[PDB]
Ligand binder design. Structure first.
Ligand SMILES: Nc1ncnc2c1ncn2[C@@H]1O[C@H](COP(=O)(O)OP(=O)(O)OP(=O)(O)O)[C@@H](O)[C@H]1O
Ligand SMILES: Nc1ncnc2c1ncn2[C@@H]1O[C@H](COP(=O)(O)OP(=O)(O)O)[C@@H](O)[C@H]1O
Ligand SMILES: [Mg+2]
Ligand SMILES: [Mg+2]
Lengths: 5, 35, 204, 528, 570, 98
């Protein structure tokens, strides 16, 4: 996921 | 706006600590006055 | 014919890597869709690469862009992020004239004002060669640089040599077919499509 | 033309009076054959050291002399190769005839070329010694000192280095400073026997030659080397030895009247060696495109490397090969101290195959030496200790070779890889298995046409581990297995030999047939 | 006013200022591995093989106050450093003294003066012209009014009796400016990096003139108070380098000093964003060429000023290399207000050249044949490196100890000035341990509470204690076997082994030998890793995993990956 | 020369038992065979007091002797060196440590 990065 | 106020306060604290610990100008050291 | 566009588009052997060389971000959108749901690792070169750099927030200088699809690039990076390999080094010139190139030695990502991007630099060449070395399928489509200029065609010849010296390589673009004909790049590629809109539809 | 006259003769040094523009080391001519160099000078007088003497001419007070105005220039002649010569170019022992038309004249005291004329040293100079080739690499253009006590085998190492160039394109120049004449003649005979005489020059200044001649011999040798390098050649230079050269210079300086310094050597004893040794290196195509490799020799007293001259020579050179008397007593040949020797160049001076073959040999040797030293006191050792002892013993047995024995670069690399794989620990104290292995590998790489192809692949191509493993498991191991069985019969009874050699093709029939037809040991294919 | 603020900056200044650009984390998540690695290499943090770790490193570098200060200043009109007490160039004179050579020898020539407009001064330079080549002779002794003695600065070939010489009654001078960066010269200013000898544009300064109004000015100095960050785990944790002091690199031959020197040059130029001056004394031609070529290749050539007194040059020329390097550093601090990291190699050769010059000029040798003015000359060299209001001059000097004799007079003279000594071991290098720094023998004066924290001191003390104790116990292990240890001794030995192997590090310059990419480890990361190892947390990992890594997490990740592969294999 | 041989046997004196004396160093360069006598061995009663661990000979080559002689000489010198090393251990740590 983009948000996890 | 690049530097936040909190980080500026931290930098001021660190610079004050450095200026207190290591003194370059000898007129900044407390002297006892003869009486 | 069908042995590449149809037969080879069903059960590719991992790892699979694709190269798209073009000067328009909004000229290959659909291709991305079928590519991202088919191929994981993709090289991107050209003016659409500079559009992607503008989307990411990097400086672009006086390079040609497509301001309409900036948010489209942001969306294609947000959903999938560890897929694309954009170049780092960019040979630059003051204007469109093919003059002796100039480089940004420090912070190679940034493109300063008064310069436009036309071709990738030696660091980008080396990193692309490193990515090419570990591969099993090659799908070349278009020039990552600007082939029409003499002082801006080193990238295409270097990547062609890298793809040919070392697994199956092919060509899937009319511009790639032209570059191969003008440079002799059929040593490793089985065949070229030159489909244009037909190639885009077969790749969509 | 003569304008100087002799006024005194003290300590074999001539004192000349006359009005001239004297310069340091200027040549003063006393006759057609006799000449000297200026050590000190005034506005009207000078001190001259004679280079050579003539029986006919007897120099006295009042004899006239001519000041040439130039420094010493050595002439280059056709028959220098395969010859022993003076510092003046006279053929003491020659193999061919001299045309008497000099090809060139070189200044013996030329300044070294600056840093922009050099190129990176990246090619291996094959010494012919396994331990030097693998653990202490020497590259073309690298000055490498050989330092040790008397009778430890330094001259032997240098001679091995020159003999290993039999099949290469390197030119050998041997400079003898204060050496015995019989030893020089024996070295010339050794050159002749090994067919390296046609490209070797010896510049000889014996122990009873004039001191100026002994001082100038290395400079003349390096001038000849520079003549050969300026036309793009590779040259290997051996100086034997620079301690005698320093002694000769000290004698000259003390006789002249120069104030003594540390150990009574003149003040500039470091300069005369640094300026001499910095003239060797690798050069770019615009400045000759050649290379000069220097192997100076230095003698220490009871292992004391703290002397002035050894310290200077260690500070100047790129690496040091130490010869130990204790290792000579222990039976090591050559008695090279690996723990003390250093090579700053490293794998940069090795081929890719050799670098891959000798990755971690120094660490294994160090661990083995530590364990062997402590073995006389310890009682309990782990299994890793047993494997370390086996590998170290195999390494010691591998790096031992006879005198004037050249071992090929690729043979050394293959032996190193065999050791690293564990294939050389079955034998012990016999060292005939390793002898037949070396013979087989040399014949395979030198005679068999496919062996020649493999040799080229190993020389100019750096192969990966898989390709080398395929080579080892398909041609080397079967040949070694068959010939080890055929010449060491009891080896088959060894459990380790049977274990390591149970998954290799048994090609004994065809190789026995080739033995019957008379093919020499090592030719596996005759596909002409 | 973007146009106005950009009007005060040259195009090269904008190119440099593109480095100090702030990137938001939202943008940073969208970069690729290749772009992140390019950014890290441009900012000197070294390559990273993980995404989130690279973003964290970039954010940590960007969140620093100095980086934010530079980024904020990069969007403002140029402010010029106003030089107080600059270096004044030499004055313009004519050739006022004329004479000729009357006595010759090896390296020493006597000059008789015929036509003089003024009396000759000590240390002035006489110029001679032979075959279109210029030779400089430095004056040593003035015997009477019209007779002096001189020694050559360079090559003495071509000099003879009656060679006319002329002098301006001035010491030797060199051309200094910012254009000296990226060029290679010798102490007297001769070009050494090309055959056509493209000149260096600058002003002529005399390196032997200090330009002090009074001696009291030499006591207006600021004692060292700061620690320079190098990115090397062992140096940062155990041997802090003073900023404005002196660090000695000691060892035998082949220990690896020059690789450390190159790594420190690169780290100072890239990470610390400064100016580097290299002064080779008795520099081998091959090593000088190699170091120049790798400086060009690695990209720190354009910010380094090289001075090379070569090994084959006269001792007088070899002696002046340190003075010329010090003068260049003084110019780069006083005139431009930039912190300079000055590198010296090799100090032993400087001492040897001084001894040679003393012996040549007929002076009575001191003990062990050294010059009577040994300590005086060492002080003369080392006393011009200091820290003043204008900036810092840090020195990192490599020394060769002959036969490991630390009581040699040259070494005894050198230790009088070193603020931190880093001693390399040939045994430790032979074990494959690099950078092969001996932690027990080396020590730093900056590992106190005046400069470091309580945590740093505690970690350093515990590390040294553990290493000494495991060194003691290893002999017992070797003799009596690993079983003879007690229960606590086994844990101590394992912790010590893992600590010793964790201190190794791959350098970005040493990629030529082993082919392994280098790394840059911050002080906090090294402290956290050593703290984790000291507690015994990673005692379940084989020792082979601790070798040549960057941070503590790499070992854990590699061990977890190997365990996963082993679990999948069966 | 071809007219005949001149075989030289020479005795060299070592002042103050200092084998680094310049005269000894100069003489070492000319001896094909070098035989060094020890004062400690003579004190122990060994006669001749020849120290084989300090001497050397260039006639120990395959060009002049057989393989067996070379092997025997090398083994003898190696054994004497090992014994000399072990005598220090015996002297300090006693005999039962071996
Ligand atoms: N590889 C070798 N195997 C066996 N003997 C060897 C070997 N190398 C040298 N020797 C022997 O060692 C002795 C010394 O040889 P060499 O002339 O090389 O010594 P050196 O160190 O130059 O001595 P010196 O001080 O007399 O010049 C000779 O007897 C020679 O035969
Ligand atoms: N960090 C390192 N990694 C690998 N090798 C090194 C390292 N540092 C030094 N070396 C080795 O040292 C050799 C060069 O020695 P050098 O740096 O000149 O040491 P010194 O200058 O102290 O003699 C090289 O061959 C290299 O292999
Ligand atoms: Mg010899
Ligand atoms: Mg060094």
């Amino acid at each position: 996921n983009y948000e996890e990065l | 706006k690049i530097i936040s106020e909190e980080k500026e306060i931290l930098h001021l604290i660190e610079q004050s600590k450095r200026d207190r610990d290591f003194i370059d100008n000898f007129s900044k050291i407390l002297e006892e006055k003869n009486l | 014919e069908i042995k590449n566009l149809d037969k080879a588009l069903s059960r590719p052997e991992r790892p699979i890597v694709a190269i798209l060389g073009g000067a328009k971000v909004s000229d290959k959108i659909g291709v991305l869709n079928n590519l991202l749901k088919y191929v994981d690792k993709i090289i991107i070169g050209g003016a659409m690469a500079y559009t992607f750099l503008a989307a990411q927030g990097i400086g672009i200088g006086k390079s040609l862009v497509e301001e309409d699809k900036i948010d489209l690039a942001r969306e294609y990076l947000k959903n999938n992020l560890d897929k694309f390999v954009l170049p780092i080094d960019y040979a630059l010139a003051k204007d469109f004239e093919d003059v002796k190139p100039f480089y940004n030695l420090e912070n190679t990502l940034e493109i300063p004002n008064g310069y436009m991007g036309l071709d990738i630099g030696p660091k980008s060449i080396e990193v692309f060669k490193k990515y090419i070395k570990d591969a099993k399928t090659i799908l070349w489509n278009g020039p990552l640089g600007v082939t029409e200029f003499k002082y801006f065609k080193e990238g295409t010849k270097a990547i062609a040599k890298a793809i040919t010296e070392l697994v199956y390589t092919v060509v899937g673009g009319g511009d790639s077919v032209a570059i191969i004909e003008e440079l002799g790049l059929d040593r490793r590629f089985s065949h070229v499509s030159t489909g244009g809109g037909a190639t885009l539809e077969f790749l969509e | 033309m003569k304008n100087l006259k002799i006024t005194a003769i003290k300590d074999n040094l001539i004192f000349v009076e006359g009005e001239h523009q004297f310069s340091f080391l200027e040549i003063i001519k006393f006759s057609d054959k006799v000449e000297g160099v200026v050590l000190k000078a005034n506005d009207r007088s000078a001190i001259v050291a004679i280079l050579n003497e003539d029986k006919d001419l007897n120099l006295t007070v009042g004899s006239l002399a001519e000041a040439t105005g130039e420094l010493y220039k050595i002439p280059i002649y056709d028959n220098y190769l395969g010859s022993i010569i003076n510092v003046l170019g006279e053929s003491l022992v020659k193999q061919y005839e001299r045309t008497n038309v000099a090809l060139d004249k070189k200044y013996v005291f030329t300044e070294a070329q600056p840093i922009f004329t050099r190129s990176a040293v990246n090619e291996p100079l094959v010494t012919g010694i396994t331990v030097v080739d693998g653990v202490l690499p020497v590259g073309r253009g690298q000055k490498e000192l050989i330092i040790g006590d008397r009778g430890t085998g330094k001259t032997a190492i240098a001679l091995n280095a020159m003999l290993a160039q039999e099949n290469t394109d390197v030119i050998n120049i041997f400079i003898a400073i204060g050496k015995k004449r019989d030893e020089i003649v024996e070295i010339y005979g050794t050159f002749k026997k090994h067919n390296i005489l046609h490209k070797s020059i010896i510049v000889s200044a014996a122990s009873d030659d004039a001191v100026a001649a002994r001082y100038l011999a290395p400079y003349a040798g390096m001038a000849i080397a520079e003549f050969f390098q300026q036309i793009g050649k590779d040259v290997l230079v051996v100086m034997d030895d620079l301690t005698n050269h320093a002694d000769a210079y000290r004698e000259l300086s003390l006789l002249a009247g120069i104030a003594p310094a540390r150990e009574a050597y003149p003040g500039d004893i470091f300069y005369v060696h640094s300026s001499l040794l910095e003239r060797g290196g690798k050069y770019g195509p615009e400045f000759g495109g050649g290379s000069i490799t220097i192997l100076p020799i230095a003698q220490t007293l009871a292992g004391d490397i703290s002397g002035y001259i050894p310290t200077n020579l260690i500070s100047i050179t790129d690496g040091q090969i130490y010869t130990s008397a204790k290792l000579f007593n222990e039976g090591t040949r050559p008695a090279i101290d690996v723990n003390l020797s250093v090579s700053r160049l490293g794998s940069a001076a090795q081929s890719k195959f050799m670098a891959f073959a000798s990755s971690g040999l120094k660490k294994i040797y160090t661990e083995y030496k530590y364990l062997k030293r402590l073995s006389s006191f310890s009682s309990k050792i782990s299994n890793r200790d047993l494997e370390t002892l086996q590998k170290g013993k195999a390494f010691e047995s591998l790096i031992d070779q006879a005198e004037y024995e050249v071992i090929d670069y690729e043979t050394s690399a293959i032996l190193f890889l065999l050791l690293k794989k564990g294939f050389l620990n079955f034998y012990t104290e016999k060292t005939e298995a390793l002898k037949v292995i070396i013979g087989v590998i040399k014949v395979f790489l030198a005679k068999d046409v496919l062996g020649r192809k493999m040799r080229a692949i190993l020389v100019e191509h750096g192969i990966d581990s898989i390709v080398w493993n395929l080579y080892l498991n398909h041609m080397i191991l079967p040949l070694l297995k068959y010939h080890l069985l055929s010449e060491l019969q009891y080896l088959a009874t060894n459990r380790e030999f049977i274990k390591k050699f149970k998954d290799i093709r048994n090609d004994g029939r065809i190789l026995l047939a080739y033995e019957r037809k008379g093919y020499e040991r090592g030719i596996a294919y005759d596909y002409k | 006013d973007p146009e106005f603020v950009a009007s005060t900056y040259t195009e090269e200044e904008i190119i440099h200022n593109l480095l100090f650009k702030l990137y938001s984390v939202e943008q940073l998540a969208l970069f690729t591995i290749d772009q992140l690695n390019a950014l890290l290499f441009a900012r000197g943090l070294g390559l990273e093989k993980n995404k989130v770790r690279a973003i964290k490193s970039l954010l940590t570098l960007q969140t620093s106050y100095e980086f934010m200060e530079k980024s904020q200043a990069a969007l403002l009109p140029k402010v010029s450093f106003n030089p107080t007490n600059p270096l004044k160039p030499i004055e313009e004179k004519e050739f006022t003294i004329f004479g000729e050579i009357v006595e010759i020898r090896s390296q020493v020539y006597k000059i008789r003066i015929d036509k003089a407009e003024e009396e000759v001064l000590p240390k002035v330079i006489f110029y001679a012209d032979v075959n279109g080549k210029e030779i400089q002779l430095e004056v040593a002794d003035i015997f009477d009014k019209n007779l002096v003695s001189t020694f050559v600065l360079g090559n003495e070939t071509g000099l003879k009796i009656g060679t006319k010489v002329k002098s301006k009654n001035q010491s030797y001078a060199i051309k200094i400016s910012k254009r000296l960066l990226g060029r290679v010269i010798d102490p007297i200013g001769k070009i050494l990096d090309d055959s056509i000898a493209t000149p260096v544009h600058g002003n002529m300064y005399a390196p032997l003139e200090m330009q002090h109004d009074s001696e009291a000015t030499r006591y207006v100095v600021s004692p060292k108070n700061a620690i320079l960050e190098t990115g090397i785990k062992v140096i940062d944790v155990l041997l802090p380098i003073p900023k404005g002091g002196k660090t000695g690199l000691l060892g035998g031959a082949g220990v690896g000093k020059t690789v450390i020197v190159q790594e420190l040059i690169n780290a100072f130029i890239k990470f610390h964003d400064g100016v580097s001056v290299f002064a080779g004394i008795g520099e081998r031609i091959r090593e000088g060429h190699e170091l120049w070529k790798e400086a060009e290749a690695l990209g720190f050539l354009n910010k380094t000023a090289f001075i090379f007194g070569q090994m084959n040059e006269s001792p007088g020329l070899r002696f002046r290399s340190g003075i010329s390097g010090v003068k260049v550093a003084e110019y780069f601090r006083n005139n431009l207000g930039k912190s300079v990291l000055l590198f010296m190699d090799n100090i032993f050769r400087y001492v040897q050249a001084g001894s040679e010059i003393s012996s040549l000029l007929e002076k009575t040798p001191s003990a062990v044949g050294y010059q009577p003015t040994l300590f005086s000359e060492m002080g003369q060299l080392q006393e011009r490196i200091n820290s003043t209001k204008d900036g810092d001059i840090t020195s990192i000097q490599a020394m060769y100890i002959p036969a490991d004799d630390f009581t040699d007079p040259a070494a005894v003279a050198a230790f009088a000035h070193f603020d931190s000594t880093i001693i390399l071991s040939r045994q430790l290098a032979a074990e494959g341990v690099y950078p092969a720094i001996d932690p027990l023998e080396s020590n730093s004066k900056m590992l106190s509470i005046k400069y470091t924290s309580r945590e740093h001191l505690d970690i350093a003390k515990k590390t040294v204690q553990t290493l000494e104790k495991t060194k003691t116990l290893e002999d017992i292990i070797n003799i009596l076997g690993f079983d003879a240890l007690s229960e606590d001794d086994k844990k101590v030995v394992e912790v010590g082994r893992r600590l010793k192997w964790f201190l190794t590090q791959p350098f970005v310059v040493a990629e030529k030998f082993s082919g392994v990419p280098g790394k840059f480890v911050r002080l906090k990361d090294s402290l956290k890793g050593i703290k984790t190892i000291l507690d015994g947390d990673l005692n379940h990992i084989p020792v082979s995993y601790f070798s040549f890594v960057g941070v503590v997490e790499e070992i854990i990740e590699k061990f977890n990956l190997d365990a996963k592969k082993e679990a999948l294999k069966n």
